[PDB]
Paper text:
[name] ([name]), a 14-kDa basic protein is an angiogenic ribonuclease and member of the bovine pancreatic ribonuclease (RNase A) family (also known as [name]). Like RNase A, [name] cleaves preferentially on the 3′ side of pyrimidines and follows a transphosphorylation/hydrolysis mechanism. In addition, the crystal structure of human [name] has revealed that it has an RNase A fold and the catalytic triad (residues H13, K40 and H114) is conserved. The enzymatic activity of [name] is several orders of magnitude lower than that of RNase A towards conventional RNase substrates, but essential for its angiogenic effect.
R95 is located on the surface of the molecule in the structure of [name]. It forms part of the β5 strand and interacts with K82 and H84 from the neighboring β4 strand6. Based on previous mutagenesis studies, both K82 and H84 have been shown to have minor roles in catalysis. In the PD variant structure [name], the Gln side chain is flexible (can be observed in two possible conformations in the electron density map). However, shortening of the side chain length in the variant seems to have resulted with loss of interactions with H84 thus providing a possible explanation for the diminished catalytic activity of 52%.
Author numbering: 0 to 121
Write the structure that this text describes.
Amino acid sequence: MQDNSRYTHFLTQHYDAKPQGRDDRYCESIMRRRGLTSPCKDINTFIHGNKRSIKAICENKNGNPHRENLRISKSSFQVTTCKLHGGSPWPPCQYQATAGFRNVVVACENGLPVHLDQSIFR
C-alpha cells in the first residue's frame, strides 16, 4: 500500500504502544520526543495498545461512521491526554496527564487513521 504521510504523522502525534507511567512527567517527555513543543500543543491525546485495533476503526470491524466523515471506534482504548498548563505558548511545556479508557474518534483515508478528534478529550 502507498505510504501515507498523514498516517505516519498520526502515529507520531497520537500513538504510544506501551507507555511508562502515564503521569505528568510522561506527558512532558513524550510531547518533547514527538516534536510537539514548538509551540507547545495545547492538548494532545495518545492511544495505547496495538496498532491493528486502531487501523480497524477505519473499517466496520472496529468502527462506525460518525458525524461529517469521521469514525468512532467500537472498542475502548487506553489513552492519555496531555493538557498544557501555565499561560505561555512556548517551552518549557508543562503538562497535566489524564489517563482514560474509552472509544476514540478519528478520520481515515484509504483505510488508515489520519486525524484524531481531540474534542472528546477536552
